[PDB]
Design a protein around this ligand. Structure first.
Ligand code: ZN
Length: 258
């Protein structure tokens, strides 16, 4: 009875194995633009993916992750509200059963078709495993996906999904430049949060971009062909793998714009 997104093992059941699910710094959250606070002291975000080195893409039964080589000071996230440097280790998405839903964070209750999470760990801590044990261990860049024109930089991902349909499958995924998944503007909202999947550790400084990237209906449709199940097991399409908004509980969401 492993955790999942079904009615029997979904978000509403997670607290039984991970009590922190009802904690004080849980993610995602709804971004109420009227209550968010513009902070003029917030510096521009610094995303350096020029030399990021992608390795493989795999279906872990919850989503698909594109992993990178984080052994060198390659892809790093810094600046913005951060006081340290974080290395990119992997990215994945969360999406729905229809274009009307799929994102984890919402803006004034609005849900996007999907949400991209670029995960980075603090260089003060040695590696990912050690970083998640600290309150400022991770910096996750969240980017909303809306339907419209195609996103060229996403095509390589879309095209390879048919080869890793079921849990446990993976494929070579070298030479992928994540710079192709970023919107033009880097304006953002930021707040202290957690991982949105178990163990739900409250070790994340969330940075959610104001500008969503546009992907075509054809592209997002491909996400919905994946399976939660492994090969040979009953079909369980991978859709609605998103955790709903959690109580802000007085944390303050700051923005780099009004
Ligand atoms: Zn995520």
């Amino acid at each position: 009875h492993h955790w999942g997104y079904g009615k029997h093992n979904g978000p509403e059941h997670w607290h039984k194995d991970f009590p922190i699910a009802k904690g004080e710094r849980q993610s995602p959250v709804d971004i109420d633009t009227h209550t968010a606070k513009y902070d003029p002291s917030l510096k521009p975000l610094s995303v350096s993916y020029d030399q990021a080195t992608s390795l493989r893409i795999l279906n872990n039964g919850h989503a698909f992750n594109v992993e990178f080589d984080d052994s060198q000071d390659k892809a790093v996230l810094k600046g913005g509200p951060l006081d340290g440097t974080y290395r990119l280790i992997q990215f994945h998405f969360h999406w729905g059963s229809l274009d009307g839903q799929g994102s984890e964070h919402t803006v004034d209750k609005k849900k996007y078709a999907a949400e991209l999470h670029l995960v980075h760990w603090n260089t003060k801590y040695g590696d990912f495993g050690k970083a998640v044990q600290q309150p400022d261990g991770l910096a996750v860049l969240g980017i909303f996906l809306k339907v419209g024109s195609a996103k060229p930089g996403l095509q390589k991902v879309v095209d390879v999904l048919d080869s890793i349909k079921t849990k446990g499958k993976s494929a070579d995924f070298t030479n992928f430049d994540p710079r192709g998944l970023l919107p033009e503007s880097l304006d953002y909202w930021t707040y202290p949060g957690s991982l949105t999947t178990p163990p739900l550790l409250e070790c994340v400084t969330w940075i959610v971009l104001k500008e969503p990237i546009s992907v075509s209906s054809e592209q997002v449709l491909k996400f919905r062909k994946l399976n939660f199940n492994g090969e040979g097991e009953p079909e369980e399409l991978m859709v609605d793998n998103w955790r709903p908004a959690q109580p802000l509980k007085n944390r303050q969401i700051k923005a780099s714009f009004k």
